[PDB]
Design a protein around this ligand. Structure first.
Ligand SMILES: [Ca+2]
Ligand SMILES: [Ca+2]
Ligand SMILES: [Ca+2]
Ligand SMILES: [Ca+2]
Ligand SMILES: [Ca+2]
Ligand SMILES: [Ca+2]
Lengths: 113, 48
């Protein structure tokens, strides 16, 4: 955002929307891949507490750790705290989830992760 | 005469500049700004 003459130089997704509080416009401009754009947005949002420092935002981009209540987690662990198998979020077996893939598509709902 | 130069005996007087021995200072007319623009014509630009 700062260093006004940045909009004439080429840019770095990391030298605009990472090491600096950025516009989703410059984010949109730099991303275009609107799926990953939503991903980066989701990042930003969850990383709202990971805005600083820089390496914290880098880790929040890695996504292996759940931020706060766990909106950002994108790992491969699909097991409950006590070893019970996780039911498919979209499937109705054995429970029909009021809160499921249709209601939360932006969390990247995997098989049972 | 002595102003004129003859190029045979190197006959050419040596005189200073009358505006350097005495500096008649007057400032400089600069009522208008002299700006310098971008090369393309527009700098910053957005998207629409
Ligand atoms: Ca900037
Ligand atoms: Ca900027
Ligand atoms: Ca900078
Ligand atoms: Ca731009
Ligand atoms: Ca930019
Ligand atoms: Ca950097």
């Amino acid at each position: 955002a700062n260093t006004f003459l940045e909009e004439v130089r080429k840019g770095n997704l990391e030298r605009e929307c990472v090491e600096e509080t950025c516009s989703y416009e410059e984010a949109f401009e730099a991303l275009e891949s609107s799926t990953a754009t939503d991903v980066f947005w989701a990042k930003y949002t969850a990383c709202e507490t990971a805005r600083t420092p820089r390496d914290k935002l880098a880790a929040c981009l890695e996504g292996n750790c759940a931020e706060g209540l766990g909106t950002n987690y994108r790992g491969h662990v699909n097991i409950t705290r006590s070893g019970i198998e996780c039911q498919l979020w979209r499937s109705r077996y054995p429970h029909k989830p009021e809160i499921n893939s249709t209601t939360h598509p932006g969390a990247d709902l995997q098989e049972n992760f | 005469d002595r102003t004129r130069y003859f190029s045979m005996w190197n006959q050419a007087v040596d005189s200073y500049d009358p505006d350097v021995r005495i500096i008649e200072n007057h400032g400089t007319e600069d009522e208008l700004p002299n700006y310098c623009f971008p090369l393309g014509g527009i700098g910053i630009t957005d998207t629409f």
